């Protein structure tokens, strides 16, 4: 049993809710919150900009030190950093950004990072301002992630569309 409340069960291991991942993280304090990161860990907009704002920019400060030491991530890759006031850890995962012309096939590799964590709170990778189809992202998620994932969907109309079209 875990403390994720009001989620709709999609499969054995994937659950979904219309909610602000910022509020969900603050409330549940999950072991892992997933950030929709870019390779430079520049948290400017969308999930990344929101999670960073909620940390009072501490996420960005930590991220800048990470990049200075290690260099950029790979598209499809990830790193584990602090969750600050939101979670124990933040898994920064880079899905392909279609608005940058990146290869959507890398979305499966991006979701494979979730399998290293037994339970996660997460957004849809490559969706929103990353430019890919959100129905597609949910499908890749369910077909790739085997660990327990709680997907918080910010946009109410998108949430309704995702539930109603889920196969
Ligand atoms: O800004 C705040 N949260 C906050 C800000 C931005 C987001 C965000 O970009 N979400 C994405 C998104 C957005 C629109 C349409 C589709 C998608 C799909 C991917 C992702 C998702 O929802 O899975 C989420 C939360 N909170 C403070 C109170 C205002």
Residue from 140, 159, 154, 160 nearest 24 by CA: 154
Q: What is the CA(37)–ligand 1 centre distance, in A?
A: 13
Output phi, psi for 49, to 5 deg: -65, -35
d(CA 152, CA 167): 19
- What are 66's two structure tokens? 């990470």
Which value in Å is the resolution of this experimental model? 1.0
Q: Quick check: is 57 in a domain? A: yes
Q: Quick check: is 136 in a domain? A: yes
Q: Quick check: is 36 in a domain? A: yes
Whole-angstrom CA distances from 68 to 25, 36, 63, 148 are: 27, 20, 9, 32
- As for how many domains the chain has, the answer is 1
Q: Quick check: is 128 in a domain? A: yes
Name the 3-class secondary structure at 96. coil
- Residues 40, 45, 49, 51, Cα dihedral to 10°: -110
How many residues belong to the chain?
167
Which residues have C-beta atoms less than 6 Å from ligand 1? 20-22, 46-47, 50, 123-124, 127-128, 134, 153-155, 158
Helices 21-28 and 46-54: angle between axes, nearest 10 degrees:
40
What's the alpha-carbon Rg for the chain, to the nearest Å? 14
d(CA 122, CA 145): 12
Do residues 144 and 111 touch, judged by C-beta distance below 8 A? yes
Q: What is the CA(70)–ligand 1 centre distance, in A?
A: 28
Q: What is the DSSP letter of 139?
A: H
Output phi, psi for 101, to 5 deg: 75, 25
Q: Quick check: is 3 in a domain? A: no
Q: Quick check: is 121 in a domain? A: yes
Residue with CA closest to ligand 1 atom 17: 128
Q: Quick check: is 118 in a domain? A: yes
Burial of 84 (0-12, 13-18, 19+ CB in 10 A): buried
d(CA 118, CA 2): 12
Q: What is the CA(117)–ligand 1 centre distance, in A?
A: 22
Burial of 29 (0-12, 13-18, 19+ CB in 10 A): middle
Name the 3-class secondary structure at 111. helix
Residue from 12, 74, 7 nearest 40 by CA: 74
Q: Quick check: is 2 in a domain? A: no
* Domain range for 157: 8-163
CATH number assigned to the domain comprising residue 152: 3.40.220.10
């Amino acid at each position: 049993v875990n403390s994720f409340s009001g989620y709709l069960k999609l499969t054995d291991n994937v659950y979904i809710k219309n909610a602000d991942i910022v509020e969900e993280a603050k409330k549940v304090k999950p072991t892992v919150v997933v950030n929709a990161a870019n390779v430079y860990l520049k948290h400017g907009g969308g999930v990344a900009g929101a999670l960073n704002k909620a940390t009072n920019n501490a996420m960005q400060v930590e991220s800048d030190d990470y990049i200075a030491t290690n260099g950029p991530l790979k598209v499809g890759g990830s790193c584990v950093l602090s969750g600050h006031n939101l979670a124990k850890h933040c898994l920064h995962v880079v899905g392909p950004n279609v608005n940058k012309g990146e290869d959507i096939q890398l979305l499966k590799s991006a979701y494979e990072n979730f399998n290293q964590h037994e339970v996660l709170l997460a957004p849809l990778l490559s969706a929103g301002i990353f430019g890919a189809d959100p129905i597609h992202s949910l499908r890749v998620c369910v077909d790739t992630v085997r660990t327990n994932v709680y997907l918080a969907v910010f946009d109410k109309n998108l949430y309704d569309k995702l539930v109603s079209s889920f196969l």
